[PDB]
Design a protein around this ligand. Structure first.
Ligand SMILES: OC[C@H]1OC[C@H](O)[C@@H](O)[C@@H]1O
Ligand SMILES: OC[C@H]1OC[C@H](O)[C@@H](O)[C@@H]1O
Ligand SMILES: [Ca+2]
Length: 298
């Protein structure tokens, strides 16, 4: 049977990112990186709250003790939603001229993974290999996993908590590492899927309840479903906008997919071809469920 696609919020984000489903409020959290906004859309009332920060905010996540955590500039921060406040928990890449965090997600043991990159001086030009992947442990200690990253993007973990999947966008590949739940350690990087030319630039990524990976293709106007064990693409889902950035599952028992995208870098023309660009899209009828997001344990 067929899927259905709806722009549930035509937010016109410059670069909508980091969609996270908050089931306790039935809301979708997301960011708009250059507007420095963290946003929350209530799926029932249709209302959106936005809090404005003081630097680019590249990701947001749940925090078990209350409120949220976020990556703002090169800083791991705690976000007081009620007070619109951010306290710095830790900082990385102090030695970089101009890096910022990019994509981030909480692991199955409550560690906040997030990687960095150089800040695009120009869409889309950026210093090479200036990023690294980090994780914020519950005890506020930061681990550095590897560097030489171009653009740290999509990431998630296998359902048996033994594999970590990772996208550095300029590798045009989805990679895998062995992963240890008890220590947060990873090793033995190998490629699991190299994108075809029409799939363009791999961006955000999430896993589903069957263990398959869904990857947002920036400029490919699609998300693709991948089987990491066989290495084959299972399915392609095309969207009305080209600059699809990330994806997550949400709605009742995680049966719907939410997709973010970007308006930045669009020409006057494409804007008339894609007026919904930068919006939040919902996809129903996939027949697969995702899994709940994890919450930072510090
Ligand atoms: O141009 C950089 C941007 O490209 C789109 C990515 O989804 C976003 O995370 C990144 O910051
Ligand atoms: O009903 C909630 C459940 O929906 C199915 C998801 O796979 C699971 O992670 C989630 O906890
Ligand atoms: Ca991204």
């Amino acid at each position: 049977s067929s899927i259905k696609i709806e722009c549930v919020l035509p937010e016109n984000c410059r670069c909508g990112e980091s969609p996270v489903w908050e089931e306790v409020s039935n809301s979708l959290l997301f960011v708009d990186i250059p507007a420095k906004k963290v946003c929350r859309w209530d799926s029932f009332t249709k209302q959106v709250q936005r809090v404005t920060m003081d630097a680019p905010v590249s990701s947001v996540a749940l925090r078990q003790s209350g409120g949220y955590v976020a990556t703002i500039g090169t800083k791991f921060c705690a976000l007081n939603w009620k007070e619109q406040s951010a306290v710095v928990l830790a900082t990385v890449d102090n030695d970089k001229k101009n890096n910022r965090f990019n994509d981030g997600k909480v692991d199955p043991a409550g560690r906040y993974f997030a990687g960095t990159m150089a800040e695009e001086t120009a869409p889309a030009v950026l210093e090479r290999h200036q990023g690294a992947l980090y994780s914020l442990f519950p005890d506020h200690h930061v681990k550095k996993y590897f560097d030489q990253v171009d653009i740290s993007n999509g990431l998630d973990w296998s359902l048996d908590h033994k594999i970590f999947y990772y996208i550095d966008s300029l590798s045009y590949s989805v990679d895998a590492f062995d992963y240890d739940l008890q220590t947060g350690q990873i090793s033995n990087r190998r490629s699991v899927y190299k994108l075809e030319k029409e799939e363009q630039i791999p961006d955000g990524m999430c896993i589903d309840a069957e263990g398959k990976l869904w990857v947002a293709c920036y400029n490919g106007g699609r998300v693709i479903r991948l089987d990491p064990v066989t290495g084959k693409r299972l399915q392609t889902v095309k969207l009305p906008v080209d600059k699809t950035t990330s994806c997550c599952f949400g709605g009742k028992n995680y049966s719907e997919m939410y997709v973010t995208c970007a308006r930045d870098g669009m020409d006057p023309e494409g804007l008339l071809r894609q007026p919904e660009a930068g919006g939040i899209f919902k996809i129903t009828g996939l027949g697969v469920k995702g899994i709940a997001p994890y919450s930072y344990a510090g």
